[PDB]
Design a protein around this ligand. Structure first.
Ligand SMILES: OC[C@H]1O[C@@H]2O[C@H]3[C@H](O)[C@@H](O)[C@@H](O[C@H]4[C@H](O)[C@@H](O)[C@@H](O[C@H]5[C@H](O)[C@@H](O)[C@@H](O[C@H]6[C@H](O)[C@@H](O)[C@@H](O[C@H]7[C@H](O)[C@@H](O)[C@@H](O[C@H]1[C@H](O)[C@H]2O)O[C@@H]7CO)O[C@@H]6CO)O[C@@H]5CO)O[C@@H]4CO)O[C@@H]3CO
Length: 381
Protein backbone atom coordinates (compact mmCIF):
# COMPACT_ATOMS: atom_id res chain seq x y z
CA UNK A 1 0.00 0.00 0.00
CA UNK A 2 1.41 3.40 -1.08
CA UNK A 3 1.57 6.05 1.64
CA UNK A 4 -1.57 8.14 2.09
CA UNK A 5 -2.31 10.94 4.54
CA UNK A 6 -5.72 12.39 5.41
CA UNK A 7 -6.22 16.08 6.24
CA UNK A 8 -9.35 17.80 7.59
CA UNK A 9 -9.75 21.43 6.51
CA UNK A 10 -12.64 23.83 7.21
CA UNK A 11 -15.67 23.13 5.00
CA UNK A 12 -15.96 26.65 3.57
CA UNK A 13 -16.58 25.32 0.00
CA UNK A 14 -14.16 28.09 -0.93
CA UNK A 15 -10.83 29.78 -0.30
CA UNK A 16 -9.59 27.93 2.81
CA UNK A 17 -10.35 24.46 1.42
CA UNK A 18 -8.88 25.32 -1.99
CA UNK A 19 -5.64 26.72 -0.56
CA UNK A 20 -4.99 23.62 1.58
CA UNK A 21 -5.81 21.40 -1.43
CA UNK A 22 -3.22 23.34 -3.46
CA UNK A 23 -0.38 22.98 -0.96
CA UNK A 24 -1.17 19.35 -0.13
CA UNK A 25 -0.98 18.74 -3.90
CA UNK A 26 2.50 20.28 -3.87
CA UNK A 27 3.54 18.02 -0.96
CA UNK A 28 2.39 14.94 -2.91
CA UNK A 29 4.22 16.26 -6.00
CA UNK A 30 7.41 16.51 -3.93
CA UNK A 31 7.24 13.43 -1.69
CA UNK A 32 5.04 10.91 -3.52
CA UNK A 33 2.79 10.63 -0.46
CA UNK A 34 -0.84 10.99 -1.52
CA UNK A 35 -2.77 13.52 0.56
CA UNK A 36 -6.55 13.72 0.70
CA UNK A 37 -7.95 17.04 1.90
CA UNK A 38 -11.43 16.42 3.29
CA UNK A 39 -13.74 19.34 4.09
CA UNK A 40 -14.98 19.11 7.68
CA UNK A 41 -16.50 22.16 9.40
CA UNK A 42 -13.85 23.62 11.73
CA UNK A 43 -16.08 23.61 14.83
CA UNK A 44 -17.12 20.01 14.15
CA UNK A 45 -13.61 18.57 13.75
CA UNK A 46 -12.88 17.88 17.44
CA UNK A 47 -16.17 16.05 17.99
CA UNK A 48 -15.64 14.09 14.76
CA UNK A 49 -12.14 13.02 15.86
CA UNK A 50 -13.62 12.02 19.25
CA UNK A 51 -15.55 9.33 17.35
CA UNK A 52 -13.48 8.59 14.21
CA UNK A 53 -10.12 8.73 16.05
CA UNK A 54 -10.56 5.61 18.23
CA UNK A 55 -12.50 4.07 15.30
CA UNK A 56 -9.34 4.28 13.17
CA UNK A 57 -11.11 6.47 10.60
CA UNK A 58 -9.76 9.86 11.74
CA UNK A 59 -7.54 12.25 9.79
CA UNK A 60 -3.80 12.52 10.40
CA UNK A 61 -3.92 16.33 10.51
CA UNK A 62 -6.81 18.29 11.98
CA UNK A 63 -7.48 21.96 12.80
CA UNK A 64 -9.58 24.06 15.19
CA UNK A 65 -9.21 27.23 17.35
CA UNK A 66 -6.70 26.85 20.19
CA UNK A 67 -9.23 27.33 23.02
CA UNK A 68 -10.13 23.63 23.10
CA UNK A 69 -6.50 22.44 22.91
CA UNK A 70 -6.20 21.56 26.62
CA UNK A 71 -9.50 19.69 26.42
CA UNK A 72 -8.28 17.81 23.33
CA UNK A 73 -4.95 16.90 24.98
CA UNK A 74 -6.70 15.73 28.19
CA UNK A 75 -9.11 13.60 26.10
CA UNK A 76 -6.14 12.00 24.29
CA UNK A 77 -7.04 13.35 20.84
CA UNK A 78 -3.68 14.90 19.96
CA UNK A 79 0.03 14.12 20.31
CA UNK A 80 2.90 16.64 20.57
CA UNK A 81 4.73 17.44 17.33
CA UNK A 82 8.45 16.94 16.67
CA UNK A 83 10.02 19.83 14.79
CA UNK A 84 13.43 21.52 14.74
CA UNK A 85 14.08 24.73 16.69
CA UNK A 86 14.49 26.48 13.33
CA UNK A 87 10.91 25.56 12.37
CA UNK A 88 9.55 26.83 15.72
CA UNK A 89 11.58 30.07 15.52
CA UNK A 90 9.72 31.10 12.34
CA UNK A 91 6.38 31.63 14.10
CA UNK A 92 5.11 34.37 16.42
CA UNK A 93 5.52 33.88 20.20
CA UNK A 94 1.84 34.41 21.10
CA UNK A 95 0.72 31.89 18.47
CA UNK A 96 3.23 29.22 19.52
CA UNK A 97 2.35 29.32 23.22
CA UNK A 98 -1.38 29.22 22.30
CA UNK A 99 -0.63 25.86 20.62
CA UNK A 100 1.46 24.79 23.61
CA UNK A 101 -0.05 22.84 26.51
CA UNK A 102 1.67 21.27 29.54
CA UNK A 103 5.05 22.38 28.17
CA UNK A 104 4.44 20.53 24.89
CA UNK A 105 3.88 21.95 21.40
CA UNK A 106 0.80 20.52 19.67
CA UNK A 107 0.76 22.34 16.34
CA UNK A 108 2.04 24.92 13.90
CA UNK A 109 -0.10 28.04 13.41
CA UNK A 110 -1.99 28.94 10.22
CA UNK A 111 -3.94 32.00 11.33
CA UNK A 112 -4.14 34.51 14.17
CA UNK A 113 -7.50 36.25 14.58
CA UNK A 114 -9.57 38.85 16.39
CA UNK A 115 -12.98 40.27 15.56
CA UNK A 116 -13.02 43.98 14.69
CA UNK A 117 -15.44 46.51 13.23
CA UNK A 118 -15.91 45.63 9.57
CA UNK A 119 -17.87 48.35 7.81
CA UNK A 120 -19.37 49.11 4.41
CA UNK A 121 -17.53 52.26 3.25
CA UNK A 122 -20.50 53.23 1.05
CA UNK A 123 -22.83 53.19 4.09
CA UNK A 124 -20.43 54.34 6.81
CA UNK A 125 -18.00 57.14 5.94
CA UNK A 126 -16.53 57.44 9.43
CA UNK A 127 -16.65 54.94 12.30
CA UNK A 128 -18.34 55.93 15.57
CA UNK A 129 -15.78 57.26 18.06
CA UNK A 130 -17.21 55.35 21.04
CA UNK A 131 -19.32 52.27 21.82
CA UNK A 132 -22.09 54.61 23.01
CA UNK A 133 -22.12 56.24 19.55
CA UNK A 134 -22.03 52.75 17.98
CA UNK A 135 -25.04 51.61 20.05
CA UNK A 136 -27.00 54.79 19.22
CA UNK A 137 -26.14 54.25 15.54
CA UNK A 138 -27.64 50.74 15.80
CA UNK A 139 -30.69 51.98 17.74
CA UNK A 140 -31.43 54.56 15.02
CA UNK A 141 -30.67 52.43 11.95
CA UNK A 142 -31.60 48.84 12.89
CA UNK A 143 -34.94 48.39 11.14
CA UNK A 144 -35.67 44.62 10.79
CA UNK A 145 -39.11 45.31 9.26
CA UNK A 146 -37.43 46.82 6.17
CA UNK A 147 -34.28 44.63 5.99
CA UNK A 148 -31.93 47.42 7.08
CA UNK A 149 -29.31 47.54 9.84
CA UNK A 150 -26.81 50.01 11.25
CA UNK A 151 -24.94 47.44 13.35
CA UNK A 152 -25.32 43.65 13.28
CA UNK A 153 -23.36 40.86 15.01
CA UNK A 154 -23.78 37.52 16.81
CA UNK A 155 -24.83 39.08 20.13
CA UNK A 156 -26.08 35.65 21.21
CA UNK A 157 -22.50 34.31 21.00
CA UNK A 158 -20.04 34.86 23.88
CA UNK A 159 -17.06 34.73 21.50
CA UNK A 160 -18.35 37.98 20.00
CA UNK A 161 -19.80 39.60 23.13
CA UNK A 162 -16.65 39.03 25.21
CA UNK A 163 -15.55 42.68 24.86
CA UNK A 164 -18.74 43.79 26.63
CA UNK A 165 -17.84 41.55 29.59
CA UNK A 166 -14.15 42.57 29.60
CA UNK A 167 -15.12 46.26 29.62
CA UNK A 168 -16.81 45.73 33.00
CA UNK A 169 -13.82 43.82 34.41
CA UNK A 170 -15.20 40.31 33.91
CA UNK A 171 -12.95 37.33 33.15
CA UNK A 172 -13.61 33.78 31.94
CA UNK A 173 -11.21 32.46 34.60
CA UNK A 174 -9.89 34.31 37.67
CA UNK A 175 -6.25 35.35 38.18
CA UNK A 176 -5.24 32.49 40.52
CA UNK A 177 -1.45 32.65 39.96
CA UNK A 178 -1.89 32.79 36.17
CA UNK A 179 -4.27 29.86 35.37
CA UNK A 180 -3.59 27.04 37.93
CA UNK A 181 -7.13 26.38 39.23
CA UNK A 182 -9.97 24.54 37.36
CA UNK A 183 -12.44 26.16 39.78
CA UNK A 184 -11.89 29.86 39.06
CA UNK A 185 -14.77 30.58 36.65
CA UNK A 186 -15.70 34.27 36.82
CA UNK A 187 -18.66 34.25 34.41
CA UNK A 188 -21.30 34.96 37.09
CA UNK A 189 -19.44 37.76 38.87
CA UNK A 190 -21.25 41.11 39.38
CA UNK A 191 -19.11 42.55 36.56
CA UNK A 192 -20.08 39.66 34.25
CA UNK A 193 -23.75 40.46 34.94
CA UNK A 194 -22.98 44.08 33.93
CA UNK A 195 -21.63 42.70 30.64
CA UNK A 196 -24.68 40.51 30.04
CA UNK A 197 -26.93 43.52 30.70
CA UNK A 198 -25.18 45.21 27.76
CA UNK A 199 -25.97 42.15 25.62
CA UNK A 200 -29.65 42.33 26.64
CA UNK A 201 -29.88 45.93 25.37
CA UNK A 202 -28.93 44.86 21.82
CA UNK A 203 -32.09 42.74 21.64
CA UNK A 204 -34.45 45.03 23.58
CA UNK A 205 -33.28 48.40 22.21
CA UNK A 206 -31.29 47.65 19.04
CA UNK A 207 -33.86 45.01 17.92
CA UNK A 208 -31.34 42.37 16.81
CA UNK A 209 -32.95 39.15 15.49
CA UNK A 210 -33.41 36.18 17.82
CA UNK A 211 -31.33 33.02 17.19
CA UNK A 212 -28.72 34.79 15.06
CA UNK A 213 -26.05 32.79 13.25
CA UNK A 214 -23.02 33.50 11.05
CA UNK A 215 -25.02 33.00 7.81
CA UNK A 216 -27.58 35.65 8.81
CA UNK A 217 -24.96 38.28 9.74
CA UNK A 218 -22.78 37.58 6.69
CA UNK A 219 -25.68 37.30 4.21
CA UNK A 220 -27.15 40.64 5.26
CA UNK A 221 -23.80 42.46 5.18
CA UNK A 222 -23.05 40.93 1.76
CA UNK A 223 -26.42 42.13 0.43
CA UNK A 224 -25.43 45.73 1.29
CA UNK A 225 -28.10 46.04 3.99
CA UNK A 226 -25.79 46.43 7.00
CA UNK A 227 -23.48 49.40 7.64
CA UNK A 228 -21.20 47.62 10.13
CA UNK A 229 -20.57 44.21 11.68
CA UNK A 230 -18.38 42.85 14.47
CA UNK A 231 -16.61 39.97 12.71
CA UNK A 232 -13.22 38.38 12.00
CA UNK A 233 -10.66 38.12 9.16
CA UNK A 234 -12.35 34.95 7.84
CA UNK A 235 -15.20 36.96 6.27
CA UNK A 236 -13.12 39.47 4.26
CA UNK A 237 -12.76 37.60 0.94
CA UNK A 238 -16.49 36.75 0.97
CA UNK A 239 -17.47 40.39 1.59
CA UNK A 240 -15.09 41.64 -1.12
CA UNK A 241 -16.44 39.10 -3.64
CA UNK A 242 -19.92 40.42 -2.82
CA UNK A 243 -18.79 43.86 -4.05
CA UNK A 244 -18.50 45.57 -0.66
CA UNK A 245 -15.88 48.29 -0.29
CA UNK A 246 -14.72 47.01 3.10
CA UNK A 247 -13.21 49.05 5.91
CA UNK A 248 -11.76 47.49 9.06
CA UNK A 249 -11.35 49.40 12.32
CA UNK A 250 -10.73 48.40 15.94
CA UNK A 251 -13.94 48.32 17.98
CA UNK A 252 -14.80 51.86 19.17
CA UNK A 253 -13.55 52.48 22.73
CA UNK A 254 -15.92 51.14 25.39
CA UNK A 255 -16.19 53.00 28.72
CA UNK A 256 -13.30 55.18 27.48
CA UNK A 257 -10.85 52.29 27.05
CA UNK A 258 -9.69 49.91 24.30
CA UNK A 259 -12.06 47.02 23.63
CA UNK A 260 -10.65 43.68 24.74
CA UNK A 261 -11.56 40.97 22.26
CA UNK A 262 -10.55 37.32 22.23
CA UNK A 263 -7.51 36.34 20.19
CA UNK A 264 -7.82 33.05 18.33
CA UNK A 265 -5.03 30.93 16.92
CA UNK A 266 -5.84 28.21 14.41
CA UNK A 267 -3.11 25.63 13.92
CA UNK A 268 -2.63 22.21 12.37
CA UNK A 269 -2.64 19.45 14.99
CA UNK A 270 -1.47 15.84 14.86
CA UNK A 271 -4.02 13.18 15.82
CA UNK A 272 -2.92 10.81 18.60
CA UNK A 273 -4.41 8.05 16.41
CA UNK A 274 -2.26 8.79 13.35
CA UNK A 275 -0.56 5.71 11.91
CA UNK A 276 1.99 8.00 10.22
CA UNK A 277 3.08 10.74 12.70
CA UNK A 278 6.47 11.23 10.98
CA UNK A 279 4.96 11.85 7.52
CA UNK A 280 2.03 13.92 8.85
CA UNK A 281 4.38 16.22 10.80
CA UNK A 282 6.41 16.70 7.59
CA UNK A 283 3.19 17.65 5.80
CA UNK A 284 2.34 20.07 8.63
CA UNK A 285 5.74 21.75 8.20
CA UNK A 286 5.20 21.93 4.43
CA UNK A 287 1.73 23.46 4.87
CA UNK A 288 3.09 26.17 7.22
CA UNK A 289 6.26 27.29 5.41
CA UNK A 290 6.76 30.99 4.66
CA UNK A 291 5.85 30.32 1.01
CA UNK A 292 2.77 28.26 1.94
CA UNK A 293 1.39 30.79 4.43
CA UNK A 294 2.09 33.80 2.19
CA UNK A 295 -0.07 32.08 -0.43
CA UNK A 296 -2.65 31.18 2.22
CA UNK A 297 -3.01 34.83 3.20
CA UNK A 298 -3.34 35.93 -0.45
CA UNK A 299 -6.19 33.47 -1.04
CA UNK A 300 -7.97 33.16 2.33
CA UNK A 301 -7.31 36.63 3.76
CA UNK A 302 -6.37 34.97 7.05
CA UNK A 303 -3.38 36.50 8.85
CA UNK A 304 -0.50 34.02 9.27
CA UNK A 305 1.33 34.32 12.63
CA UNK A 306 4.64 33.74 10.87
CA UNK A 307 7.30 36.18 12.05
CA UNK A 308 8.61 37.33 8.62
CA UNK A 309 5.10 37.38 7.09
CA UNK A 310 3.64 39.56 9.88
CA UNK A 311 6.24 42.19 8.96
CA UNK A 312 5.80 41.75 5.20
CA UNK A 313 4.50 45.19 4.07
CA UNK A 314 2.26 43.33 1.59
CA UNK A 315 0.41 41.94 4.62
CA UNK A 316 1.25 44.31 7.50
CA UNK A 317 0.25 47.54 5.73
CA UNK A 318 -2.80 46.06 3.99
CA UNK A 319 -5.63 48.41 5.14
CA UNK A 320 -7.89 45.41 5.82
CA UNK A 321 -5.23 43.57 7.87
CA UNK A 322 -4.08 46.68 9.78
CA UNK A 323 -7.49 47.07 11.48
CA UNK A 324 -7.47 43.47 12.72
CA UNK A 325 -3.87 43.73 13.97
CA UNK A 326 -4.80 46.88 15.92
CA UNK A 327 -7.74 45.21 17.67
CA UNK A 328 -5.75 42.01 18.31
CA UNK A 329 -2.99 44.08 19.98
CA UNK A 330 -5.51 45.10 22.67
CA UNK A 331 -7.00 41.60 22.98
CA UNK A 332 -6.30 38.47 25.01
CA UNK A 333 -5.82 34.89 23.80
CA UNK A 334 -8.78 32.65 24.60
CA UNK A 335 -8.12 30.38 27.58
CA UNK A 336 -6.89 26.96 26.48
CA UNK A 337 -7.06 25.08 29.78
CA UNK A 338 -9.18 21.85 29.73
CA UNK A 339 -12.16 23.51 31.52
CA UNK A 340 -12.67 25.80 28.52
CA UNK A 341 -14.34 22.70 27.03
CA UNK A 342 -17.21 23.19 29.48
CA UNK A 343 -17.63 26.96 29.02
CA UNK A 344 -19.09 27.53 25.54
CA UNK A 345 -22.42 25.65 25.54
CA UNK A 346 -23.74 26.97 28.91
CA UNK A 347 -22.57 30.55 28.30
CA UNK A 348 -24.06 30.65 24.79
CA UNK A 349 -27.25 29.08 26.17
CA UNK A 350 -27.28 31.92 28.73
CA UNK A 351 -27.09 34.48 25.91
CA UNK A 352 -30.07 32.75 24.21
CA UNK A 353 -32.21 32.87 27.39
CA UNK A 354 -31.56 36.61 27.86
CA UNK A 355 -32.04 37.42 24.16
CA UNK A 356 -35.45 35.70 24.15
CA UNK A 357 -36.49 37.56 27.32
CA UNK A 358 -36.87 34.27 29.19
CA UNK A 359 -34.21 34.69 31.90
CA UNK A 360 -32.44 37.74 33.36
CA UNK A 361 -28.69 38.34 32.96
CA UNK A 362 -28.15 37.35 36.61
CA UNK A 363 -30.24 34.18 36.52
CA UNK A 364 -28.85 33.04 33.16
CA UNK A 365 -25.23 33.52 34.26
CA UNK A 366 -25.78 31.89 37.67
CA UNK A 367 -27.37 28.83 36.05
CA UNK A 368 -24.61 28.65 33.43
CA UNK A 369 -21.71 28.66 35.91
CA UNK A 370 -23.39 26.01 38.12
CA UNK A 371 -23.64 23.78 35.02
CA UNK A 372 -19.99 24.50 34.16
CA UNK A 373 -18.76 23.58 37.66
CA UNK A 374 -20.82 20.36 37.75
CA UNK A 375 -19.49 19.26 34.34
CA UNK A 376 -15.87 19.91 35.42
CA UNK A 377 -16.51 17.29 38.14
CA UNK A 378 -17.12 14.77 35.32
CA UNK A 379 -13.98 15.61 33.30
CA UNK A 380 -10.33 14.45 32.94
CA UNK A 381 -8.67 11.04 33.52
O1 LIG B 1 -21.10 29.32 10.44
C1 LIG B 1 -20.60 29.35 11.77
C2 LIG B 1 -20.24 27.98 12.24
O2 LIG B 1 -21.43 27.15 12.10
C3 LIG B 1 -21.24 25.77 12.54
O3 LIG B 1 -20.89 25.79 13.90
C4 LIG B 1 -21.67 25.28 15.01
C5 LIG B 1 -21.04 23.98 15.48
O4 LIG B 1 -21.06 23.01 14.45
C6 LIG B 1 -21.83 23.45 16.66
O5 LIG B 1 -21.23 22.22 17.11
C7 LIG B 1 -21.80 24.53 17.77
O6 LIG B 1 -20.43 24.78 18.07
C8 LIG B 1 -19.78 24.62 19.32
C9 LIG B 1 -18.31 24.35 18.93
O7 LIG B 1 -18.30 23.10 18.22
C10 LIG B 1 -17.37 24.37 20.14
O8 LIG B 1 -16.01 24.15 19.73
C11 LIG B 1 -17.48 25.76 20.80
O9 LIG B 1 -17.07 26.75 19.89
C12 LIG B 1 -16.40 27.93 20.31
C13 LIG B 1 -15.02 27.87 19.60
O10 LIG B 1 -14.31 26.71 20.07
C14 LIG B 1 -14.22 29.14 19.93
O11 LIG B 1 -12.94 29.12 19.29
C15 LIG B 1 -15.01 30.33 19.41
O12 LIG B 1 -15.11 30.21 18.05
C16 LIG B 1 -14.90 31.15 17.04
C17 LIG B 1 -13.72 30.72 16.19
O13 LIG B 1 -12.54 30.63 17.01
C18 LIG B 1 -13.50 31.75 15.09
O14 LIG B 1 -12.41 31.35 14.27
C19 LIG B 1 -14.79 31.87 14.23
O15 LIG B 1 -15.07 30.64 13.59
C20 LIG B 1 -15.39 30.47 12.17
C21 LIG B 1 -15.20 28.96 12.00
O16 LIG B 1 -13.81 28.67 12.18
C22 LIG B 1 -15.72 28.44 10.66
O17 LIG B 1 -15.54 27.03 10.57
C23 LIG B 1 -17.22 28.79 10.58
O18 LIG B 1 -17.88 28.16 11.64
C24 LIG B 1 -19.04 27.34 11.46
C25 LIG B 1 -18.79 25.94 12.00
O19 LIG B 1 -17.70 25.36 11.30
C26 LIG B 1 -20.06 25.12 11.77
O20 LIG B 1 -19.89 23.79 12.25
O21 LIG B 1 -17.35 30.21 10.68
C27 LIG B 1 -16.89 30.85 11.92
C28 LIG B 1 -17.15 32.33 11.73
O22 LIG B 1 -18.54 32.56 11.51
O23 LIG B 1 -15.91 32.25 15.09
C29 LIG B 1 -16.18 31.26 16.18
C30 LIG B 1 -17.37 31.71 17.00
O24 LIG B 1 -18.58 31.79 16.25
O25 LIG B 1 -16.33 30.35 20.04
C31 LIG B 1 -17.18 29.18 19.85
C32 LIG B 1 -18.47 29.41 20.60
O26 LIG B 1 -19.36 30.18 19.79
O27 LIG B 1 -18.87 25.98 21.18
C33 LIG B 1 -19.88 25.95 20.12
C34 LIG B 1 -21.20 26.21 20.82
O28 LIG B 1 -21.40 25.33 21.93
O29 LIG B 1 -22.42 25.79 17.27
C35 LIG B 1 -21.67 26.34 16.13
C36 LIG B 1 -22.36 27.62 15.68
O30 LIG B 1 -22.22 28.67 16.65
Amino acid sequence: KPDKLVVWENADDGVQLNNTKKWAGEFTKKTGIQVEVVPVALLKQQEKLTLDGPAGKGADLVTWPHDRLGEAVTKGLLQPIQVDNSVKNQFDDVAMKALTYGGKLYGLPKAIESVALIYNKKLMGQVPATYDELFQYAKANNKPDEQKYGVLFEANNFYYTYFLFAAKGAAVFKEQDGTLDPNEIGLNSPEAVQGMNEVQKWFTEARLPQSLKADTVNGLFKSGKVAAVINGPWAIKDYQAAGINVGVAPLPKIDGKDAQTFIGVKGWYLSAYSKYPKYATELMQFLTSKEALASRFKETGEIPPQKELLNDPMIKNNPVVNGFAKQASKGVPMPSIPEMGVVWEPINNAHTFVAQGKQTPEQALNDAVKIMKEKIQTMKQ
